[PDB]
Design a protein around this ligand. Structure first.
Ligand code: HUE
Length: 84
């Protein structure tokens, strides 16, 4: 049930308060949400929108932005970054 994130993703999780390097998928998603908060990547006016371009998260997603209503690009990134 646990996964090991690749190094760039691991750095992101730690910036969000995570410890160690083995996580459940739900932990990864929790900490990614927390990362978005701490780095203030969301639009205060449209809080469903995240602007990740120019942040390491954007580089990993291959995106400038995404909506939290549309999780599709997120789970594809996790496939390419989480080793089970
Ligand atoms: C349902 C869930 C979700 C979870 C996964 C996915 Cl692929 C989509 C959606 N979700 C709903 N809104 C968010 C969210 C929105 C804006 C900024 C930060 C987080 C999230 C995300 C969580 C999370 O663990 N969220 C706890 C509840 N959230 C409500 C919104 N809250 C705040 C939003 C910003 C302003 C203050 C309230 C934080 C607590 N983790 C995520 C990680 C990513 Cl890669 C993307 C989004 C989220």
């Amino acid at each position: 049930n646990q996964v090991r994130p690749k190094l760039p993703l691991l750095k992101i999780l730690h910036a969000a308060g995570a410890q160690g390097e083995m996580f459940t998928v739900k932990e990864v998603m929790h900490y990614l949400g927390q990362y978005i908060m701490v780095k203030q990547l969301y639009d205060q006016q449209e809080q469903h929108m995240v602007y990740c371009g120019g942040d390491l998260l954007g580089e990993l997603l291959g995106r400038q932005s995404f909506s939290v209503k549309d999780p599709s690009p997120l789970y594809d990134m996790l496939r390419k970054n989480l080793v089970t």
